[PDB]
Amino acid sequence: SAVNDPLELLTNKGTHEPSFLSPIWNPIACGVAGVGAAIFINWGFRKPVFSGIQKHIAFGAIGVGAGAYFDQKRNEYLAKRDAVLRHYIELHPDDFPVKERKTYGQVLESWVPVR
Amino acid sequence: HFYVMLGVIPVTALVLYANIFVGPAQLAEIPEGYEPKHWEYEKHPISRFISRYILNSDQQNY
Amino acid sequence: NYEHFKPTGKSFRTGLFAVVLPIALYAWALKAERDGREEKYRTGQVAYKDRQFKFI
Amino acid sequence: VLGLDKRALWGALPLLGFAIGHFLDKKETERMTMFRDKSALYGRPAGSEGKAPSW
Amino acid sequence: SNRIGDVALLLSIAWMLNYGSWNYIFYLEIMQNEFEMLMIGSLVMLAA
Amino acid sequence: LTTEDFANPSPKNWQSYGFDYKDQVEDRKATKSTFFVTVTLCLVWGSFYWAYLPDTQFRNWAQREGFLELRRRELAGVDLVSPNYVDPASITLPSDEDLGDTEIII
Amino acid sequence: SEYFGGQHLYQKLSMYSKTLFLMHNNSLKIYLLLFVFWILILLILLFL
Amino acid sequence: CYTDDAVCRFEADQQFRRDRMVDNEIVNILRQRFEDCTLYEAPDHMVKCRPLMDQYEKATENWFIKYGDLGGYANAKTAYMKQKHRLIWERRHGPVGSGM
Amino acid sequence: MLKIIFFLLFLIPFCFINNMYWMVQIMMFFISFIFLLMNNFMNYWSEISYFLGCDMLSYGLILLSLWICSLMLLASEMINKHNNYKNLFLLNIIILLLLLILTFSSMSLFMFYLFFESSLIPTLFLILGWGYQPERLQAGLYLLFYTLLVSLPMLIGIFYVMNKIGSMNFYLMNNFMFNYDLLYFCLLCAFLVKMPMFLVHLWLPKAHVEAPVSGSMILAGIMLKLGGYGMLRVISFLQLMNLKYSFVWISISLVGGVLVSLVCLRQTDLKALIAYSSVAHMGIVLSGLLTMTYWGLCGSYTLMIAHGLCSSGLFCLANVSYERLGSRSMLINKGLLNFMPSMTLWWFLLSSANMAAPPTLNLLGEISLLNSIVSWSWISMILLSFLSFFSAAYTLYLYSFSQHGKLFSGVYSFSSGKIREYLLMLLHWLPLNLLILKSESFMLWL
Amino acid sequence: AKWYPDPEFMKQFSGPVMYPDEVTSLWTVPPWNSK
Amino acid sequence: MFNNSSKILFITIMIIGTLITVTSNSWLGAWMGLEINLLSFIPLLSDNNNLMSTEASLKYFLTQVLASTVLLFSSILLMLKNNMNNEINESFTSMIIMSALLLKSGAAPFHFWFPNMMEGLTWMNALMLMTWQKIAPLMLISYLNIKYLLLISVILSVIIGAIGGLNQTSLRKLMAFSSINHLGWMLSSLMISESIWLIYFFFYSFLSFVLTFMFNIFKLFHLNQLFSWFVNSKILKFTLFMNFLSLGGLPPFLGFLPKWLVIQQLTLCNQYFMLTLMMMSTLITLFFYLRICYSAFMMNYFENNWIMKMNMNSINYNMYMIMTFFSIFGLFLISLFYFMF
């Protein structure tokens, strides 16, 4: 495109593929955090670090569920933010105008001589 | 000396196996419509094997 | 050695004439030489093939 | 030769981490592919879907 | 007394930066009359 | 200690290497394995790999392309090294009234 | 260097911490009096 | 290409680096030609090596026209702006070396 | 890349297993061998995985980090002979190496900053935990407060660059150019402290001495090079303003190199003299960085690579006399040619590497750095000759007075040299002469 | 591992303030159960 | 502090009064909630076993009722000038309102009651004082739009709160002076956002809970008392003392995150000199945090040998070790957070 249109910058074309770690990073990081918190509890009480694995299982399940829930709420928050930005760009076409793209050839600026 | 000889002996076996029993490629013009691969762009068999099986291509990183 | 140090005039004279004055004189000399070469470079008094250190 | 005892069986954990990192790098170079055989330096003529990908 | 020779070869290399190749024998008979090569010769003469 | 004790040294009086000072078994295993992972892997096999490393930098390709370009440039005879980045007719310079008071650097 | 450096910075910070502990050894009425004066200039300017 | 696009800047920077390495090899081979002239014509290097030395000096001059005074971070746009200012200074002040 | 990072992340549970001190350095040398294998890098960023990628400068710095940490586990056998906390030491070393790999393979300026200032906390922990001096508190506080005081406004500069540009990536920030004094001072002065200046050095000779051997390796081997990497990433968009203000730093660095080279002739400690020796060579690195030439940048990268090995190898040599003679004093360390004659090979081979030496990478870094500084101005030929003469005037003094002469009377009986120490100083010198072969690797990052 | 914090080092933390002056040198420490 | 159910009653009514304060749509119902919060925070901060707690409650009463009557007088004056609760052009009555709020909060021109009261308390009423009692004044400060009073308060808070904590060897006065410096970062965030303030306040509250639980379970009130504290493994004492480095704003731990978000939002709001004035005056806070960390960062000490068992609560220390893990490994949760935007 030869124009710097502000509306097409925020409009999702759908060509962006999410990564492998993007949907699954937060539940496994919070599960590892829950397992490490249970290990930290067992270390602070001078228990064996893998004694009472039910606490580790419950902490990991709580972490996986909370990570999935807050990741879904995070995605809904970012979608609403994108809708807000697109709606404010659409509502005010004078403050955000399409700007013609300029080739380097038109511009002439400042080589900094090293010498 | 033991641990430099234990390195050199399989290395020198692989070097004489690559030069004598395989041998380097011969330079030639590109045929029309070939579209050669990245490991075709080097001469030595060890360099070709490293660029084919181990190292990523320049096109992929580019 | 800091516990026996006080800002006297002898210590100020030593710290001025030992460290700050060669630094100031060297910086002034480098700036003067580079400005004198840079005005000749920017004015255009030197040829293209007759300039030192082409990195060639 | 090298001497490895029974404690060398604990070294499967960094090899498992190396396999996990290599799998994540393979997934990353699988995703990062919209400019594959479409850049103007390493380009390909018409009929690129019939031909195999370069990487 | 040889470290001053080391720094004189270092400055001679730094002034052979002008002509690029530090193989001086191919530029001796050509640029015997240049100021930059006279600087090179003075530094390597101090080194010797 | 007597003469026959020094002539035939005891196997229990062993001088340690630098790795462990508790038992002789951990010295030999760590010594042989540390000499394995540094000398015959990082210094010999790694140097053999780096000897036959391909053109990561394009320095060999630069020399081949320079030889072919110097074959073809002096045949055309325009320039051995081109001084201009683009063609001087293709570039559209601004006029003197367009620039005004702008710092032109040379 | 330690003057205009870390040692003299630590000495000046220790002196500033020692002279601020004398501010906090007073009664509550002094600080509340300071607040009452700060209200008092803030109400004199409301007249003007 | 446009200022907002970073796809063109990477590709033009890469061909500028490749052309820099090729032109460096041009100057290197033209210097090695003069060195081989000096070794092969050992007593009489004064007469025969003069066209090669003139060609090498023209190569050094053209290399300093294009890539000269750019610094360690030489983008493709930096040489283009240097060419723009050089052509402007050649238009209004004549050739560099007798400028005002 | 992610293979090395996940390798160290799964090497983290090796610390909690008892009698597992020597397997971690085995796996560290194995991942250094694997990192020697993955060498398909050019001047642009390759192996792009999320926010992690690598170019040639980053490749050399991660390889130096892995080699210095792998030798750092080899040098510290005093931690293993005593019941000092081996698990915490191994965890701190693995965490610090992971942070160095993360701050060198950072694609952007901000993640580089984040892991860059995360790296100083394990160095703090090693200095205040495993040192052998009462002034470890004076050592770590000087380091942390110097680097933190000058690196906090660099964060304001970093977000000012983000607000003006939009991006954090190095390539997109290479396009822009700023004409502000205070942005230049913010984005430069933190690295100007992180590599030693003359005026801002103080944390260096008072933090190298009171640290352990491992603190000395990690400080003079890779954490004087974080500032060099940072300036190599920042100088590209601050060229106009550094060309205005670079004569002050270059003149201060050159006169400070001459003056600190005069300091080392009046030093009575082995570990302090190498600490001031790190100031003189990095002064040449700093003086060649600000000239912005191809040769200055390439020779600066080559001299940082070749200095992180040789200064660390000299710091291992001062440790193996401190373990036996009981003190770091230069008066005590006399005539070690008659005590440890086989060590004297490694003393002179690593002291010659500190100066210009015939087969080392330090000479190829010093030649390409003096080229740019003599090209910068002709007045620098007076003070580069004095600095490079005084460098071997002081560096020969440490080998001469420690390794030649009459023996120090009244020394008690100590152990002889060991194969681990000979292997430790073998791997600090054979990389310095095997890397002139394939030197276009470790020099041409551009 | 050769120097460890001696009672001379923890002497400076035993006062009523960190840096005593002529006023606070005559002060006493609070009770250790804070009541 | 749970010796009686009446204290739980006072806790829920002080929560109710603070929520009445921060949700009032007028300047007088906020004062009503302030008086409810004051009534329920007088019996807490008072006990029979400690002699200093009664005179500290007297100091709290005189300080708050001096601040609440000036807050009422200036709000009635604003209502007498312009009869809506807001003000078109800001004037001196908003300055009197903000100064009366700063006496409530404890900004550094008016902070001298804060460590002098803190010198004689327990570690749970201090936890209520520097966390919940900073909710009611600071949430009213966000309604005013004068800049120079906030500027003077932020600058004076970050120099006076950092320098003044150096001489103090008592842990309560040192934590009060550290909370005065962390107060100034909250008011600097209040000039640019009402959400970044919530970020900084919530994680500063989190760090206050996890750090004052170390001194409440083991009953630590002195710097020298930290050196005599017996932990069975010295690695655990070294690990538990990383909350000081966390709260001081160091990058691998949590606590770097809210300070970093304040830095990110202030630079985007073109305020650079005040940020430099705060961050040159936050190194002193890490200095008296690291002076605490003398007692754990070294690995061996000249301990007193009469005590050989570590005695601790079960439920409180079980709650403590969850929050200690997230105080130092909590930067992994930045990918899950979405409340910065």
Ligand SMILES: CCCCCCCCCCCCCCCCCC(=O)OC[C@H](COP(=O)(O)OCCN)OC(=O)CCCCCCCCCCCCCCCCC
């Ligand atoms: C570290 C040691 C050195 C430290 C001091 C270095 C000082 C360098 C001084 C020269 C550079 C700055 C001055 C010149 C600026 C540029 C002007 C110029 O080009 O002048 C050249 C000058 C005049 O000659 P011109 O006619 O121009 O052409 C030369 C051939 N016809 O040409 C000449 O005058 C020709 C001679 C030039 C100088 C050559 C010698 C320099 C080194 C002198 C010291 C060492 C000498 C040997 C040892 C003696 C003591 C033991």
